[PDB]
Amino acid sequence: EVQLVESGGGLVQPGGSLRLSCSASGFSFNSFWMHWVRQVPGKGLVWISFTNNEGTTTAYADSVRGRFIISRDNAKNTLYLEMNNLRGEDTAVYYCARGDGGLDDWGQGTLVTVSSASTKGPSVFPLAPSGTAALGCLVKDYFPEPVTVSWNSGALTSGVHTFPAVLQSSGLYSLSSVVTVPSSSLGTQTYICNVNHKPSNTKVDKKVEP
């Protein structure tokens, strides 16, 4: 297998509209109820809406009723959420889930950011290394979230800590990603952080060295 893939999320002005999609595969889509659940970054799960098998029975949370519309296209294996008159309180990761005994399968979610702030790509700075040694990358001054960081194209995973982003005094986010390595490998092994800030189309591969 079951795969649920949400799309359509992004930065939108307050009062604006967005349409989310959820692609389903590995099951008989038309045989199950489908739900939308949201989660404000670092807060709890909030149920938003559901539809029965044919889209003839629908319901919504009190804070979204009259603004959102759930729908499904059974022939195209797709679930939708039309969101209108968006506000700051609608900023969240939106998940689609297949209903069975409970909400059995969930997608990775799609972030919706309701703001009048501009998209801005980050600057990527090295955190130069000094037993084991630490090095990393500082991903500074971007908006909206999220940024992803991998090391050596996903080959270096051990000892990697990618910190949660922090909102700075400026209103821009910043994050660091660090890795601990043997001081022995500082000459023989190249260390590159692969940064992607998809919201601003910014892809940076930064080589970190002494």
Binding site: V37, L45, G101, G102, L103, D104, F125, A134, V178
Partner: protein
């Protein structure tokens, strides 16, 4: 609308011990015709989508360890986790599937209590590339420590800094149950060049006395 209240909001339980998490519904969620209590339990690990554990209050989903079990009736429900493992670090939610809106409880954040582990401390000067741009970010890393509580004090030429740093902490590691923390001191290129000694002093239960890591601006 049915309200679900979980208790406690946060819980710290030792490895190999039993965790008890409560969920109370504002009204009954027993569907007589199906003879089922319509309560679900989810585990949401750090950075991941929720995972359904149990449905119909006591029916465990296939592939979920027998260490997880649901119990209760009508308005009082319980999630039990026996022989707590490091990978159990997550926020746990209850949800009613009785009548719309299919509401969730507020979540219970489960912390895995492990032995004390002191942080490994590292300091990073601002890069030359950043310094060209007019700002200096000085980073202090506290790696793989337990418990969460840690004091990070910045010192610029032995003068203690306050109000010019920000911290970020990782979620407990799914394998070793530790935390890592970064503290970033931000100064203008002008203020950064007016000083020599940049120090990060760390206080933690695992350290007999504070560990200070420093660098000289020029060196």
């Amino acid at each position: 609308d049915i309200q679900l209240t979980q208790s406690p909001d946060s819980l710290a339980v030792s490895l190999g011990e039993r965790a008890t998490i409560n969920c109370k519904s504002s009204q009954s969620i027993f569907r007589t015709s199906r003879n089922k209590n319509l309560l679900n339990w989810y585990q949401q690990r750090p950075g991941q989508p929720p995972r359904l554990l149990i449905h119909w209050a006591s029916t465990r989903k296939s592939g979920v360890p027998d260490r997880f079990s649901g119990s209760g009736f009508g308005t009082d429900f319980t999630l039990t986790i026996t022989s707590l493992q490091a990978e159990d670090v997550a926020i746990y939610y209850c949800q009613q599937y009785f009548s719309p809106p299919y509401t969730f409880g507020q979540g219970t954040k489960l912390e895995i209590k492990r032995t004390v582990a002191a942080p490994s401390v590292f300091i990073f000067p601002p890069s030359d590339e950043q310094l060209k741009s007019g700002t200096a970010s000085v980073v202090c890393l506290l790696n793989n420590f337990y418990p969460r509580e840690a004091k990070v004090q910045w010192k610029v030429d032995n003068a203690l800094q306050s109000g010019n740093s920000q911290e970020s902490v990782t979620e407990q590691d799914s394998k070793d149950s530790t935390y890592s923390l970064s503290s970033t001191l931000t100064l203008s290129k002008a203020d950064y060049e007016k000083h020599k000694v940049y120090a990060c002093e760390v206080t933690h239960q695992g350290l007999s006395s504070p560990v200070t890591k420093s660098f000289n601006r020029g060196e």
